[PDB]
Amino acid sequence: DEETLKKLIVRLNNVQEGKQIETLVQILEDLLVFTYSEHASKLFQGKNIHVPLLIVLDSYMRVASVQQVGWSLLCKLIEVCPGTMQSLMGGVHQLILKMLTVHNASVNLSVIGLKTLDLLLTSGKITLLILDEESDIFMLIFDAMANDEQLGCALHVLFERVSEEQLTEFVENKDYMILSALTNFKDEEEIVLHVLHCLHSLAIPCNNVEVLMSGNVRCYNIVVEAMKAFPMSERIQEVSCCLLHRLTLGNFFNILVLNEVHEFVVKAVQQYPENAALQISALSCLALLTETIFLEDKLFWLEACYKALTWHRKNKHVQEAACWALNNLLMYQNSLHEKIGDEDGHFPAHREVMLSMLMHSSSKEVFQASANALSTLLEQNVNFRKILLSKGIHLNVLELMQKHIHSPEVAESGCKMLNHLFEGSNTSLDIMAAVVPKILTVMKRHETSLPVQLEALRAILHFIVEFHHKLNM
Amino acid sequence: DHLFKVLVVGDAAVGKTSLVQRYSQDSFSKHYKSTVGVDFALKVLQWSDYEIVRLQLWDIAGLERFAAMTRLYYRDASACVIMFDVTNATTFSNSQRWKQDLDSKLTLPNGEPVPCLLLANKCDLSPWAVSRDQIDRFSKENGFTGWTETSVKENKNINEAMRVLIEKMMRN
């Protein structure tokens, strides 16, 4: 048992004959891969088992045997020994990159090296060492790419920090390389996932959108992947959706493609409504693209937004994006004003919107978006007037603007909402005393901003005009 | 014998006086009216032999929510409760506002927060009636002493909830 393993590791330290050491390493690798016990993981974790092997492989590069089986042996050891990654750090990256550099031109030698690199990069804190080497790891992996086992899809983590100029260089060269990968490996779900999220990672710089939209290749490929490759895959749809969200800009007038992606977005939010995975990205993307497109679907959007608020109350971002989408939809489509409300067959989204505002007072963005949404809703349908007033909206937002004063956008949205709320209604002296001083103080605190002043003046205008004695005070 | 003060707060038109009339004046349902100012009620409970407790229920008018909730009402108070109608999430947000206000402007001799109970007013009304799963989020998040559904008109659970709350209050 362990005595034979001790003899093998002792003989491994001799480094006498390359062929004999190769056979011993092969026998040790064959014996180690078993489910009998953790004898191979005897807690020693001695580098003397594998450091001389990699030294011999690097120095004697012509020895293909140690290259072929030493990588498999270390892969099996890492997959078996739990603290092997802990033994890696606290180097080996230099050794593996030299292995990939000098003599890994064979398919068999390359695949094991890329697999070992992929499993090593799942540990963390070693990527910095990999990116600060001298072997040009990005050039190595680019030179690596028609094999089905595309282990180079582990290039993922390398995009986490690449800098803008090198990112543009990767955009060009790696896009030229990766289009072939996605075309020849269309029937590989994991490969499609990795390629799509690598596109996500490289799409961070703003200047590269024009490069990505050189011939609408990005839009077409992502739409085709969403349509065909993944009818019922959550990860693919989520990644493609995040690409859709990050690829919205001044060039949004991709009219036909607009319509296409819009449909796909609907499909996405209708087929996986359980996590932020799709909801936030699609709703923000959808809101902008719906504005552009509109210049049925609206009912589906209302339903999707209602479940988005309902099922993700704990996340600020989801509710913000969803209520913003509801606002942007209602702005361009007013026919559904009666389609929403407390009555049966209509989504009670007004209470959900109010809830969003109250449950995230600490954030100005949620207040801004939800306030604009319910202000547009109140302006659309007159029936909702005096209902939210009876529900506690006026004094509540007054206290909220008292809490949030450092920004002008929040004050402007609040004043606009008061204007569209209090229109066509008559208040009492108590409401006057509870409204006028607070809005006057808010207007004083933000005197320079023109929209805030306009909305405040409009609100005061719509709101200003025994009983005589009280009114005099 | 002992005396105590309980302050009932909540949104407007939530039948704030309905519950206090039901528990003390034995008046339930009735017409829905607006409470202009703070009103008072007395309750006497024979909790134990030779131990009779008196309760002063102050039903704070929620119309002036934007107005500064003066600490004089909560001054010398021994207990409080927030009761909101179940047909509006705005009553729920208002209850959050009341909870924040009382946490900011209420003190006890031991310094610990006084017991608070979440009353789900008028559950005998469609459609948002038994949504206890949504209520549980704030029930465990706000750290309230208790939470209990109720119906002022039917008086289905006013007595048990009030007994639980007062037992918790004397437990301190």
Residue numbers in the entry:
A (entry chain C): 12 to 101, 113 to 167, 172 to 175, 177, 179 to 181, 183 to 207, 209 to 325, 344 to 513, ...
B (entry chain A): 5 to 176
Please quote the paper that reports this structure.
We determined cryo–electron microscopy (cryo-EM) structures of the Rab29–LRRK2 complex, reconstituted by mixing LRRK2, Rab29EM, GTP analog (GppNHp), adenosine triphosphate (ATP), and Mg2+. We thus introduced three point mutations (Q67L, T71A, and S72A) to Rab29 (Rab29EM) to maximize the opportunity of capturing the active Rab29•GTP–LRRK2 complex (where Q is glutamine, L is leucine, T is threonine, A is alanine, and S is serine). T71A and S72A prevent Rab29 phosphorylation, and Q67L abolishes GTPase activity and enhances the interaction between Rab29 and LRRK2 (26). The observation of LRRK2 dimers both in the presence and absence of Rab29 suggests that COR-B–mediated dimerization of LRRK2 could occur under physiological settings.
